[PDB]
Design a protein around this ligand. Structure first.
Ligand SMILES: *Cc1c(COP(=O)(O)O)cnc(C)c1O
Ligand SMILES: *Cc1c(COP(=O)(O)O)cnc(C)c1O
Ligand SMILES: Nc1ccccc1C(=O)CCC(=O)O
Ligand SMILES: Nc1ccccc1C(=O)CCC(=O)O
Lengths: 387, 387
């Protein structure tokens, strides 16, 4: 036996940080400690009980009644992978509206799954219009439309009202990525006639990463039932996964081992948002964004999505002013305040920082602190910047 | 906003259990509390530091020097998915030796990935001989051979010495599933000339489920670099994943958010097995299995793998005696001793219970307790059984 590594001899030390990037967010002490519960057998009654509480929690936050509501055992990417491998067969047409990094990933996945990918470009800072989409649908007769709802690479919030209805008219499924919007802005899976949605644990909910709530409509469920070939990935085949999640009128069968610890944590995160109520949580985040916009204005700082009406409240791009080294600000923030001041991604790469109003930092005091430590970080770091 | 569900208003209560099924196992308190550390950003220095300690710990337990050692973000199935999607292109020939449920799952996955699947059948209670495998390889000229090492559905341990060498002669990769064997029996990834291996967190290691250590050889890594088409699943594309895990001479790029909390837990589980040392851990499990076998004999009870030389120490099938209701015994064990007495799977389904010697229950006292509460459960539940 070639010797054990020395690096494992020190204890593990992870410092506390104020996670105000657009992910992952701070989880409440209650959510974090729920993770320390006993890992359960796939068929223990108490896991099933907890899994049911989660499905309820998910129906509340997605605002759906979908029986096929469950979690994929993976990060939000795996919700994306799941929607695409379940809903498309080789040669199917999928329409992706691309104006952010996520829609590009979707493009990358659909290609791999052997779908015939149709895209429309858009400015990273301006939503696609109802008509733009409608036109693209008629034009391509797709099986699915994929839309990013809240785009954490830009700060862009894509309106959704009416979009599904159009898709339905052209026999198309609406798939929406709500990873960065859910619990940050109104969302109505059912009213907005949306067929397949996913969020992420570690964004607005303030749950730990590695598990991804999803939901599909009876309509979508049926498209899967009627595939001519098995979907490509067994691990997130939704007939099989849905089965173990008790979404169908079938006895549950072992599929794969779920991450009990992550499921406990997610349950508590949903319990938190239930006790306070969706509406208040969304309100709280809107108000925090307002305070954020004011404080940024007052520093003569620019926001990537210029037009306020288009802004996702939970992620804001702050434009690096002309003279400034963005990374130097962040190091200062981290070292002096333990403040997470996140760089850019895709559209915002090298052009803005990104601030998240998520999880435990969605409070007035938390936004103030951010403003304070951000400013102090800029000031100490670029002494010639003018406010 | 349609009302919050009532189920979420009670506190979460998860009882302590003695988890002596063949998974998941009991995690030490240290491992469990590591999960309560701060969720880190994908680019925090301290996540990368931890990720490296993990890779070192993996090389130790796998006994490899592979640079391409990392984790998939999903349960062990996802490691299986990963090997198969990365190493196979449409039409490639894969040889799977099938004699347990896991090899069946590998069949299911390979079919979905559009491989041309070749199998050989074997009795669930007897390993595949070197000659049987060698003959099958010549016959089928496969690209990959898949073997289950330790089968948790039977308790069968498949010898591996010599297998890789044969595959190499015929230009074939050796893929091994070590989910149930690693840290329970000697395992030498490099000496045994194996090209791709995975284990699971929640089996022998005593780590929480949801993250899957894997390793690939330079030989396998190269097969992936030379594919004519992108692998079907972006999420566990190993060139991409390995990049983020800093397995290659490339700057790290964002791939997906990994599960910091599960990674913290795994790090501590590897630290634990490092401090005690492989050899000692394996010895402790062999002794425990011995005590198990004796006590089971003393009760007149039969083991599914009849020949002791073929047994996997970490999972033992206990045959249900003629008169007996297996589930009634299990309920009694749980209700009266908080003792997990798991039923069957695949080959053992309805035929046997399954006991695991894994994680925090790999001690002599724990085995004795199991024997005690098992016997008392049988006795109280089937008063006419004879010892
Ligand atoms: C227990 C076990 C598994 C289970 O996979 P999960 O996805 O973790 O449930 C897979 N392979 C083997 C050999 C096992 O023993
Ligand atoms: C943050 C985010 C992701 C990230 O996915 P992970 O796999 O959780 O890293 C995906 N989609 C959207 C819209 C996001 O905001
Ligand atoms: N917990 C479980 C509950 C039901 C079915 C399976 C499991 C497993 O953990 C799979 C590993 C095995 O049983 O061999
Ligand atoms: N922490 C990160 C660091 C780098 C890139 C991505 C992340 C993410 O958390 C998820 C995507 C995002 O919102 O940026």
């Amino acid at each position: 036996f070639t010797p054990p590594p020395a690096s494992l001899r020190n204890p593990l030390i992870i410092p506390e940080k104020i996670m105000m990037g657009p992910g992952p967010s701070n989880c409440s002490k209650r959510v974090l400690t729920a993770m320390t519960n006993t890992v359960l057998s796939n068929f223990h009654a108490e896991l099933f009980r907890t899994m049911d509480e989660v499905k309820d929690g998910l129906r509340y936050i997605f605002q759906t009644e979908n029986r096929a509501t469950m979690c994929v055992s993976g990060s939000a990417h795996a919700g994306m992978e799941a929607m695409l491998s379940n809903l498309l067969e080789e040669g199917d047409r999928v329409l992706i509206a691309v104006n952010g990094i996520w829609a590009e990933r979707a493009v990358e996945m659909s290609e791999r799954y052997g779908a015939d990918v149709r895209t429309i470009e858009g400015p990273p800072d301006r939503p696609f219009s109802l008509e733009t989409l409608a036109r693209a649908i008629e034009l391509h007769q797709p099986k699915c439309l994929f839309l990013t709802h809240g785009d954490s690479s830009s700060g862009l919030l894509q309106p959704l009202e009416g979009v599904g209805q159009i898709c339905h008219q052209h026999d198309c499924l609406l798939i929406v990525d709500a990873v960065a919007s859910l619990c940050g802005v109104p969302f109505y899976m059912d009213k907005w006639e949306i067929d397949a949605v996913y969020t992420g644990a570690q964004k607005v909910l303030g749950a730990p990463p590695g598990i991804t709530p999803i939901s599909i409509s009876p309509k979508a469920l049926d498209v899967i039932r009627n595939r001519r070939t098995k979907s490509k990935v067994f691990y997130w085949d939704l007939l099989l996964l849905g089965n173990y999640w008790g979404c169908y009128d079938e006895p549950k069968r072992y599929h794969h081992t779920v991450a009990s610890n992550l499921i406990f944590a997610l349950r508590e995160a949903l319990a938190q948002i239930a006790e306070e109520g969706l509406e208040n949580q969304i309100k709280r985040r809107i108000e925090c964004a307002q305070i954020l916009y004011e404080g940024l204005g007052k520093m003569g700082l620019d926001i990537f999505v210029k037009d306020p009406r288009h802004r996702l409240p939970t992620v804001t791009g702050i434009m690096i002013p002309k003279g400034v080294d963005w990374w130097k600000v962040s190091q200062y923030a981290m070292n002096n305040f333990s403040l997470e001041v996140q760089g850019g991604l895709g559209p915002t790469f090298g052009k803005a920082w990104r601030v998240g109003i998520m999880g435990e930092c969605s409070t007035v005091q938390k936004i103030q602190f951010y403003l304070y430590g951000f400013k102090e970080s800029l000031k100490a770091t670029h002494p010639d910047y003018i406010f």
